[PDB]
Amino acid sequence: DMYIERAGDITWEKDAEVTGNSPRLDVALDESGDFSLVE
Amino acid sequence: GETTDGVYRVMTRRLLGSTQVGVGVMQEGVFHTMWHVTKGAALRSGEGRLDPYWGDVKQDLVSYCGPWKLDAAWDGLSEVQLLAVPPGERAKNIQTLPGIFKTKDGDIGAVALDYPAGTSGSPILDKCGRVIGLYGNGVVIKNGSYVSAITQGKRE
Ligand SMILES: CC(C)Nc1nc2ccc(C(=O)Nc3c[nH]c(C(N)=O)c3)cc2[nH]1
């Protein structure tokens, strides 16, 4: 059985940790909701 | 049950101890999560029951108690924040500039941040704090890291 538990407020935090890149990827989305790479 | 707006953990006691299978957003009395997290199953909030209302396996989204409420979209230019809620760890905001998922049916924003599958459902926010989508449905790239779509539903 599944249960929910509050974890926090939804707010933008000024001066948050900035990380991660911005790649442009060719993808396909199948009938089951799974993304795959088209290369 | 607790109906206050905010981010929530989705937990289960059907494995060893208490395990976090995902995350979700409570907004306007409606709970929003990714379909792969609950598989459309009913949820408990204290001594209350949340029944599914809308869902779609292809979009990988599900809403509880009412129709999908989140309609903000990534503007295609500005940085965004992943409000990550990892298993056994506190909620933490991570800023990034989204990449793109190019599909035959159009482009979608994507966040190149890698958190375990139990983080699925964590919201992605714009500068005014509006939810532009949920983290957790993506792909594994050449280097083995995860890149997730910014998945947003439709508000009727
Ligand atoms: C190891 C490294 C790459 N980390 C990594 N972070 C992940 C986050 C999510 C998932 C994940 O499995 N999503 C999903 C499951 N099912 C669906 C569906 N659409 O049915 C999406 C996998 C991850 N792996």
Side-chain angles (χ1 to χ4, degrees), chain B residues 100-119:
Chain B
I100 302 293
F101 265 10
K102 304 187 178 174
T103 88
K104 65 172 211 281
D105 300 315
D107 292 1
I108 316 171
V111 286
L113 298 170
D114 197 332
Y115 285 85
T119 309

Side-chain angles (χ1 to χ4, degrees), chain B residues 14-150:
Chain B
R14 79 140 192 120
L15 296 180
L16 188 87
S18 301
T19 312
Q20 180 180 315
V21 294
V23 179
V25 173
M26 190 68 72
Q27 188 166 132
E28 301 155 63
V30 165
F31 189 65
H32 306 68
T33 191
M34 313 219 76
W35 198 88
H36 73 266
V37 168
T38 71
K39 307 290 176 180
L43 303 172
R44 135 165 76 95
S45 177
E47 268 189 339
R49 188 189 174 114
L50 307 195
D51 298 327
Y53 184 100
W54 168 80
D56 188 83
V57 155
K58 190 170 171 173
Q59 305 320 126
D60 189 28
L61 295 169
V62 57
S63 72
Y64 289 78
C65 315
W68 187 272
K69 301 289 177 172
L70 320 180
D71 55 0
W74 176 48
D75 63 6
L77 283 145
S78 341
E79 286 196 338
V80 307
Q81 285 184 6
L82 170 60
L83 166 36
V85 181
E89 296 171 358
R90 207 164 46 246
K92 174 197 47 161
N93 289 65
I94 312 292
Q95 193 162 317
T96 191
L97 175 85
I100 302 293
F101 265 10
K102 304 187 178 174
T103 88
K104 65 172 211 281
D105 300 315
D107 292 1
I108 316 171
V111 286
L113 298 170
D114 197 332
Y115 285 85
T119 309
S120 290
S122 287
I124 301 157
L125 329 170
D126 68 15
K127 294 190 254 182
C128 331
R130 289 181 295 142
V131 180
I132 63 170
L134 306 182
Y135 173 88
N137 193 28
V139 91
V140 161
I141 60 173
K142 177 162 294 260
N143 49 229
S145 168
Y146 208 69
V147 173
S148 171
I150 298 182

Side-chain angles (χ1 to χ4, degrees), chain A:
Chain A
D1 196 33
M2 289 175 191
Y3 64 96
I4 61 168
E5 245 178 13
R6 203 162 178 276
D9 285 9
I10 293 169
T11 59
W12 176 269
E13 178 202 345
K14 268 172 277 171
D15 310 309
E17 168 180 34
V18 193
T19 198
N21 65 336
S22 338
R24 305 192 165 188
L25 306 164
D26 282 336
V27 311
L29 172 65
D30 75 3
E31 198 183 88
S32 307
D34 298 313
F35 285 108
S36 55
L37 271 188
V38 176
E39 283 238 9

